[PDB]
Amino acid sequence: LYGTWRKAASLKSNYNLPMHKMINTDLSRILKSPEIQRALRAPRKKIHRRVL
Amino acid sequence: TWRRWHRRVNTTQKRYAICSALAASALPALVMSKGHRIEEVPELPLVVEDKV
Amino acid sequence: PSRLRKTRKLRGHVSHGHGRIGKHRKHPGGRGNAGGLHHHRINFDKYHPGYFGKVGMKHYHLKRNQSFCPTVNLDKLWTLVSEQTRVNAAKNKTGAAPIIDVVRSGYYKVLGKGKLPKQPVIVKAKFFSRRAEEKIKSVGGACVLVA
Amino acid sequence: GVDIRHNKDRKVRRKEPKSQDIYLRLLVKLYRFLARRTNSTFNQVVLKRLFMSRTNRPPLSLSRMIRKMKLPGRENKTAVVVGTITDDVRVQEVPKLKVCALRVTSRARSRILRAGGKILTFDQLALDSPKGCGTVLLSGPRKGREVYRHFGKAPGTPHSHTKPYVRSKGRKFERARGRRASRGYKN
Amino acid sequence: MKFNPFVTSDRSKNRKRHFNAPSHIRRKIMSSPLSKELRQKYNVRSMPIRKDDEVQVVRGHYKGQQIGKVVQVYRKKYVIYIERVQREKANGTTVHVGIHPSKVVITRLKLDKDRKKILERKAKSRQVGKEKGK
Amino acid sequence: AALRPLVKPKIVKKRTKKFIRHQSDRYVKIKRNWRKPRGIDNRVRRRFKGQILMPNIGYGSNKKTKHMLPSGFRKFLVHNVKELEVLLMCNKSYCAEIAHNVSSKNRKAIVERAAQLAIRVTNPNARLR
Amino acid sequence: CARPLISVYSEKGESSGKNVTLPAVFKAPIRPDIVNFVHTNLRKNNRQPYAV
Amino acid sequence: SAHLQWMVVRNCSSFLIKRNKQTYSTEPNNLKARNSFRYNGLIHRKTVGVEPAADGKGVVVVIKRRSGQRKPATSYVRTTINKNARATLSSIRHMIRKNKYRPDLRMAAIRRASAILRSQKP
RNA sequence: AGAGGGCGUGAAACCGUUAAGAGGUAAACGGGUGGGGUCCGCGCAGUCCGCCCGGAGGAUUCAACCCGGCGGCGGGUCCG
RNA sequence: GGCGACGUCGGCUACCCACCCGACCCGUCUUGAAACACGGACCAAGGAGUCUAACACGUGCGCGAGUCGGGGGCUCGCAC
Ligand SMILES: [Mg+2]
Ligand SMILES: [Mg+2]
Ligand SMILES: [Mg+2]
Ligand SMILES: [Mg+2]
Ligand SMILES: [Mg+2]
Ligand SMILES: [Mg+2]
Question: Which of C96, E69, A20, A36 is nearest to D21 (CA)?
Answer without folding.
Answer: A20
